[PDB]
Each structure stands twice: as structure tokens, then as C-alpha cells.
Amino acid sequence: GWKYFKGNFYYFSLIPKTWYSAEQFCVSRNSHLTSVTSESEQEFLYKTAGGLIYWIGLTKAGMEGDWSWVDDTPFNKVQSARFWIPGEPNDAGNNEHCGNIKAPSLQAWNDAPCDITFLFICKRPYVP
Ligand SMILES: CO[C@H]1O[C@H](CO)[C@@H](O)[C@H](O)[C@@H]1O
Ligand SMILES: [Ca+2]
């Protein structure tokens, strides 16, 4: 039940997991929690999400707490500013170190506590 979009397959989970347990599940399926690197990808993801919240590959790295992609796609702070929900990341309780797709819009991302369970999206490259 993987959905194909532009050289990648995506898995929209039916079971909710914590950010890391979801990531482990993806890694066990030769994938990672999805990065988002274009407007068309963001749009594909939030429309497929159908108004439900899904963990994606957003998580903090380094001492400064910069956001990063768990699949090691370099995080482009400038080019991703448009993808956050207005007001996010707000870091609530000083404990929101992972990211999900929340709002059904281009401005979709929210930071949430990593140990909260949500549905999740894996991303797997297609290699011909
Ligand atoms: C109540 O907290 C929730 O809503 C705020 C926005 O008000 C988000 O930033 C936060 O991560 C939670 O999802
Ligand atoms: Ca938040």
C-alpha cells in the first residue's frame, strides 16, 4: 500500500507510534520518515493526509536545536519557512523536538513532543 510520487514511494500508516518508533518502523521497511523538499511534495503529502496529523522526518539536531531531516536531507531553513503553521515552531513546554504535518495547507508543519503517538509517513526511494 505504498503510494508513488516523483521517484519515491510513501507509506501512510494506519497505526500511531511515537516519532522514534515510527522512524524505526520505516527503517525496518528500508525507508525513513519523510523529508519534504518542494511545494509539490508538501502538497502531495497534506492532501493525501486528508486532514489527519502525521509524523514526518522533522527533528532537532546540534546544540543550537536547529531542525533537521532524519533521512539526512540538508534542512534548508529559508526554503522551508513557508511550510510551518503560522506561529510554529513555538516549542511548547520546551519539549517539542519533532515535527508533523498538521494543517491541510502548504503552511502545515507543527512541532510536537516526540513521545506522543501519531500516524506517520515513511518515504522510500525507487531505484530502477
Ligand atoms: C496546545 O498545544 C497544541 O497547540 C499548539 C498551538 O496552539 C501547538 O503549537 C502545540 O504543538 C500543540 O499541538
Ligand atoms: Ca508546536
**Pick from 51, 55, 47: nearest CA to 123:** 55
CA 94–ligand 1 middle distance (angstroms): 12
- Cα separation, 18 vs 2, in Å, equals 21
Strands 119-125 and 54-61: parallel
Q: Which three cell numbers stand for residue 64?
A: 543550537
Measured in angstroms, the resolution is 2.0
Cell 526554503 appears where?
A: 79
CA 88 to chain centre: 14
Question: Would you tell me which CATH number, out of the four given (3.10.100.10, 3.40.50.1220, 3.40.710.10, 3.50.50.60), belongs to the domain 1-128?
Answer: 3.10.100.10
Our separate counts of H helices and E strands in the chain read 3, 8
Extended beta strands in 32-92, E state: 32-33, 54-61, 66-69
Name which residue sits closest to atom 13 of ligand 1, judged by CA. 112
Contact 28, 122 (CB under 8 A): no
Is the CB of residue 79 below 6 angstroms from any atom belonging to ligand 1?
Answer: no
Instruction: Indicate the domain borders of the chain.
Output: 1-128
